[PDB]
Ligand binder design. Structure first.
Ligand SMILES: OC[C@H]1O[C@@H](O[C@H]2[C@H](O)[C@@H](O)[C@H](O)O[C@@H]2CO)[C@H](O)[C@@H](O)[C@@H]1O
Ligand SMILES: [Ca+2]
Ligand SMILES: [Ca+2]
Length: 109
């Protein structure tokens, strides 16, 4: 499988991990502009994009991923454990943003 993540940080120090079934497939440091990050995997389970180094000044915006050619918008995903919403991390779904450490789930490969 081929997976492309389109994402940015706000300050350029942010780290994200592409995970499949809980296995980290690849980690990247983001820049302050949307860019594409691509990895391959034989794994087939639940895809997550996780922000792992939250700190002052650091937040992640994930536009979408592409899975074997299918674009899956971050904001179309019901599960986002990092968005700051309703005064808490993970207070709602359907967001591009990871403010807190947490992940967006994009369903199975
Ligand atoms: O401190 C909890 C959490 O805050 C996040 O920023 C929030 C902020 O707390 C809130 O006052 C403001 O209006 O919303 C922002 C998010 O947009 C911060 O991004 C997290 O790193 C931090 O854990
Ligand atoms: Ca989007
Ligand atoms: Ca933050």
């Amino acid at each position: 499988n081929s997976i492309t993540v389109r994402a940015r940080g706000v300050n350029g120090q942010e780290s994200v991990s592409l995970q499949v079934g809980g296995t980290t497939v690849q980690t990247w440091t983001l820049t302050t502009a949307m860019q594409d990050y691509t990895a391959s995997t034989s794994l087939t389970g639940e895809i997550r994009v996780a922000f792992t180094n939250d700190a002052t000044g650091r937040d992640v915006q994930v536009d979408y991923i592409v899975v074997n050619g299918q674009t899956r918008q971050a904001e179309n995903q019901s599960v986002n454990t990092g968005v700051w919403a309703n005064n808490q991390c993970g207070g709602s779904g359907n967001s591009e943003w990871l403010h807190c450490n947490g992940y967006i789930s994009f369903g199975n490969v």
